[PDB]
Amino acid sequence: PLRRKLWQNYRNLTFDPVSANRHFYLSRQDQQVKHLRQSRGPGGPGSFELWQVQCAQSFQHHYWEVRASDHSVTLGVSYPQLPRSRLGPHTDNIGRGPSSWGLCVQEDSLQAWHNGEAQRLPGVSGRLLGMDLDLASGCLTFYSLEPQTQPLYTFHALFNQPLTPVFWLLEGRTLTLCHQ
């Protein structure tokens, strides 16, 4: 029922090929992204060195659903000032700086990263996930759908810039959106 109460602020999304990483691949009318060992040629400018992609949409409320192939992936949203280069051997940036909010899912437990800080959250079994963002209250929350609706965690902040979803992926991991 709550999902029904949500979907009037549901928003559809699609990626940006420029920001896609080298080994990454876009498909299904730019609504599905897949990771492959083989490179899609050189990366070039406008592409995130680390394994992240951002969608064409940003928000100057909003809800959307996401389905994922398997765990060991990260979903989040950042300011448009997210770094694109690389400085650390680890291949994820989101949540390291205060300009982004992150949530990484693993087979064991959940971790929500921001300003380089994260806490352990009890793990989940399903892969389809949902999330709410309210600009008026400056509140970002994460939900799980299968089998039931779990209000996983809420983030409080004040935003002075539009927010763009950014997704961190692993090899042999595929990520897909939803639309209605």
Partner: protein
Amino acid sequence: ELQLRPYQMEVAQPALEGKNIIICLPTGSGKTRVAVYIAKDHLDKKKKASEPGKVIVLVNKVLLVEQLFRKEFQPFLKKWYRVIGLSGDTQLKISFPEVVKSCDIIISTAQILENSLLNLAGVQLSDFSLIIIDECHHTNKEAVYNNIMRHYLMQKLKNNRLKKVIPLPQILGLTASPGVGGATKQAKAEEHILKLCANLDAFTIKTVKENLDQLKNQIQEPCKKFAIADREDPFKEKLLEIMTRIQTYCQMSPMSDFGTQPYEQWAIQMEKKAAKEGNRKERVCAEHLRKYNEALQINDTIRMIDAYTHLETFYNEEKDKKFAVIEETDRFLMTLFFENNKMLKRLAENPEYENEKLTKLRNTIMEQYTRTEESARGIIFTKTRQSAYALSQWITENEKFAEVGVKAHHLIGAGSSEFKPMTQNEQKEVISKFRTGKINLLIATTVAEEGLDIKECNIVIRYGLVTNEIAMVQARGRARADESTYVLVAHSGSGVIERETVNDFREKMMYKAIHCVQNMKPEEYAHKILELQMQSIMEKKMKTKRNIAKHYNNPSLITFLCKNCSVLACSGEDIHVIEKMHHVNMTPEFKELYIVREKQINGEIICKCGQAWGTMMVHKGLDLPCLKIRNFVVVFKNNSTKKQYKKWVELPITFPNLDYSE
């Protein structure tokens, strides 16, 4: 700060006052500190009573010598005593007896002591007071520890004959898993524990029974995770029809499918039979198909490239040896092989096709390191040395590994006939680098499953390994870190997970049984122990007479023949030995028979067939080629039987040494 944790002092209580006994605590609970503390008390008390007291520490793997030397003994006794760390690699400049006569705490490998004890001037066991024996579960049928303890036991029984004496030094031995000798009975398990105890001449196992929870807090059970996989690629089947054509040419019945251990065993034994017959046109074919088989086995284990390189190297040198004589079934092989191999190199070079196991390995490595975020040390345990080295190359090549910050190196023991032998100094610095942390992933073999104390090991990984129970308990122990993860990787094709299952149940048997013996009645304990002591001695004597009678020899009776050809090589009187070590022939016409070849400081001998015979060596200013008994065939003169031997010790012949007057 030699302040023990409570349980440590608790289990050390019987040890403080004589009572040569054993201590077993679960892995990662610092037994070495117990050894150090006990040693300090022993030496200090003996000094207070003013008697010559010493202690020797025995370890069974070289790497641990330096580890235990500079990590637990140096830092705690730099002011109190003279501790010296000695191993078979360090260039001594002074005899062993004086080494012991100078210092008082020795850290050495057991083989050194046993060498020094069978030299009857040498040394006597009585010269020592305390014998620390680390990882003494290896005390078994004719192992290095068993010999030493059998001398000790023999003296003890002599003392009992005297009573109805000479002091026998106090004994300590450290274990983590005594294990069972493959026993599906409760009786055989508890028996096995008793056999170990008696062979150690212990008094009481003395394992913790008081401070349980704090122990549960110190040690951590790692999380177990299973990676099991089970892609079609013609390369396997491409080798298949090539080799089936090869087998069908000589129309051999396999009696089993290809690529299996029984097939390899059958291939070797039938190749031996063919060489016994003198059957050419078959022998060579048998060896070559064998080579294909081992190539396939490596092929399933590791990537395609190295497996192809192995075969290509063999055939390259094969034709290289063949063309030397220039200066029918033979060519029958290379003709088809070379077209096929060109195609294979074309097929092998394609990296899209990949082994199933390696795939899951890549998944595991990436998942674990990325989840850890730059705080992760991982140890991968393998089986064969070249597996370790090739996996290192596989790490090196694909740049996707390095981006995650994994820094990998391969660690193996010293000593073959392959890429390159790594030497002791190199591995010593390798472990040094690993402790620092700019070598992030370590690929190891059997050498380092017992004793490594790296404080940060989040990841311990087993790659298609099958083994007994101790070699699994210790492997899980290596992850001496919090949230430690133990991952088993294999494919369901072989008996791997089932080996894991039976190993698990066997482990539980062992714990319950040691609890059983833990609670026996002292007099019955003594009777059973004594009886076992006897048993070992009488059986050793019986084996002694069996061996000495088995040894039974004309040095001229036999003559040697090629295997590839059968041309007579030389007779018995032509062979002489250097320092009881190396057989060799001086005969000048025999010098004319063979061919030298170089790729060199030493030359390799080549027959007329092209088969190798021996290697050139220079000794005491003489130039002289040697021979390997594997390369030849023995022929007697009383019975015309065609026999072979892999090594020289089997042959009952005795040779004269070297007239050097020539």
